Design a protein around this ligand. Structure first.
Ligand SMILES: CC(=O)N[C@H]1[C@H](OCC2=Nc3cccc[n+]3C(=O)C2)O[C@H](CO)[C@@H](O)[C@@H]1O
Length: 513
């Protein structure tokens, strides 16, 4: 392994973070090594933060200007100057902590300048603050209360619900309560939001909301508004698909069958309309090799930043440089960006390691690897998932040390295609044998089998129903996994096709119920 001094000479990157983390967790960083260190951390969040602050806990940070203001409590707040008073009253917990006499006083003080404060102050002098804020139609206060406690739930009138989307907090709020199935009175009130007043994801989610109460008309209008406003074509297609499912206008399905975006919805539309399968590019570079060390994590991280920080002209220079068999995953990575994501790249690198698996298992492996890494051997994620199949270190060690007992096993073996594909196959077997559907497998690869089993046990998920299974696909409670499923499923269809082992996507959907 590389020492801390040798890491310090490399550019900040997720690779460097990973390796610093690995020293940390094996307790190989002294208090003296850890001094100048958070100048060397590319992204100072998560576990590397936790770990480095067990050595050097951070004193900061409260602004030197308001330092005075954090020396008062709910007992001494009326002794605070007027700035200090207003600063501390940013916290709804602080306000809750005050007694009701002090709230009445402070509320008189602020009714002129800060009636936002006044309203919250007076709100916490009632048994139900939300109800007070709702009656005042204080939008800022509504969201402060929502962030403070998710437990307030109350019917909102048309006037008020239509003001809510104007606030930055609305999107997360709506997605939260609709996916989690919380705040039933909020959700029911959101049926009266005018579609004119929302766009993009908010409008999409309000469409899902409307379906759950069997309000198909409002749902369509919500989905329509989502389709017209969405930035990405994939999302636009998701919304058009619903537009069609609800009303069945063939204009909508045709638009969807003709989409440039390859996704489960455009694939399904093409199947229903007898539209041919989309053009999949074919990359067979003659040249066999170049310099590039495909096993070097640091080399990838630098070439990666070059590919993001590159004008459409610098890309052509990289494309030609990496036009080899050895660097085929990079070639395709560059190409994908270069042609502005209009062409469809579905490579099959390191094929010898999977050619003996049945074709259906091959497709799943490839589908997962495409989404997880675009087949970059030394790919590292923000949570330090490793290699082409993006194994979390816990699971990689459990498999390699305990289950497959590989000799001299290190987790950096996940950077090896032969290992990635083999551990991938192993883990996929465990999941397929319990879940069957490759969609369900995909949810569990990403978010674990506990989460997936909890979801399938539910009465209202992946059961029979008017809009099933598409509705349940919209209600998978982890956003990361909800998206991952859709994408891996589309990769699966495509890879089964390229492997001369086609399946109708409608068959996939029937076996979800
Ligand atoms: C390298 C990386 O961060 N991969 C993550 C992957 O990132 C999606 C990627 N998507 C794309 C898309 C186009 C080009 C390149 N990439 C990537 O390199 C990675 O997202 C998954 C969840 O959906 C994560 O589990 C996975 O670790």
């Amino acid at each position: 392994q590389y020492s801390i001094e040798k890491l310090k000479k490399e550019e900040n990157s997720l690779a460097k973070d990973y390796y610093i983390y690995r020293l940390l967790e094996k307790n190989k960083i002294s208090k003296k090594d850890a001094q100048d260190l958070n100048s060397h951390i590319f992204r100072y969040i998560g576990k590397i933060k936790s770990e480095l602050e067990k050595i050097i806990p951070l004193k900061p940070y409260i602004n030197p200007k308001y330092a005075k203001c954090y020396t008062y409590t709910a007992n001494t707040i009326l002794d605070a100057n007027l700035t200090c008073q207003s600063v501390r009253l940013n916290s709804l917990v602080f306000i809750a902590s005050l007694n009701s006499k002090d709230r009445t006083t402070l509320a008189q003080t602020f009714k002129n300048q800060r009636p936002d404060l006044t309203n919250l102050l007076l709100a916490f002098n009632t048994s139900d603050p939300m109800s007070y804020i709702v009656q005042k139609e204080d939008i800022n206060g509504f969201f402060k209360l929502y962030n403070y406690s998710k437990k307030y739930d109350l019917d909102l009138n048309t006037s008020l619900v239509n003001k809510l989307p104007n606030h930055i907090g609305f999107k997360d709020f709506a997605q939260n309560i609709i996916i989690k199935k919380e705040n039933p009175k909020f959700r029911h009130s959101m049926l009266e939001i005018n579609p004119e007043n929302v766009s993009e994801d908010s409008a999409f989610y309000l469409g899902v909301n409307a379906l759950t109460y069997d309000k198909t008309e409002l749902a369509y209008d919500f989905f329509k508004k989502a389709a017209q406003s969405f930035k990405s074509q994939s999302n636009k297609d998701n919304a058009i698909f619903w537009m069609w499912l609800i009303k069945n206008n063939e204009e909508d399905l045709k638009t969807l069958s003709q989409s440039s975006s390859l996704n489960i919805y455009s694939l399904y539309a093409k199947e229903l309309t007898n539209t041919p399968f989309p053009k999949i590019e074919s990359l067979n570079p003659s040249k066999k090799k170049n310099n590039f060390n495909m096993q070097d994590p640091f080399a990838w991280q630098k070439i990666n930043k070059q590919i993001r920080d590159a004008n459409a002209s610098q890309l052509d220079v990289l494309a030609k440089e990496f036009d080899t068999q050895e660097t085929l995953p990079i070639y395709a990575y560059i190409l994908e960006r270069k042609n502005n994501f209009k062409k469809h790249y579905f490579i099959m690198p390191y094929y010898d390691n999977i050619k003996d698996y049945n074709k259906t298992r091959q497709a799943l492996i490839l589908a997962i690897a495409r989404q997880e890494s675009r087949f970059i051997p030394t790919a590292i994620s923000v949570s330090y998932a490793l290699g082409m199949m993006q194994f979390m270190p816990f699971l990689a060690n459990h498999i390699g040390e305990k289950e497959l007992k590989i000799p001299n096993f290190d987790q950096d073996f996940m950077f090896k295609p032969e290992i990635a594909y083999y551990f991938g196959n192993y883990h996929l077997n465990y999941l397929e044998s319990r879940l069957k559907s490759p969609l369900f497998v995909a949810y569990a690869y990403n978010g674990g089998i506990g989460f997936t089993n909890r979801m399938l046990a539910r009465n209202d998920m992946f059961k029979t129903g008017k809009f099933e299974p598409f509705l349940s696909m919209e209600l998978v409670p982890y956003q990361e996994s909800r998206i991952y499923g859709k994408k891996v499923l589309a990769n699966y269809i495509v890879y089964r096709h390229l492997l001369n082992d086609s399946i109708k996507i409608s068959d996939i959907f029937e076996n979800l119920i």
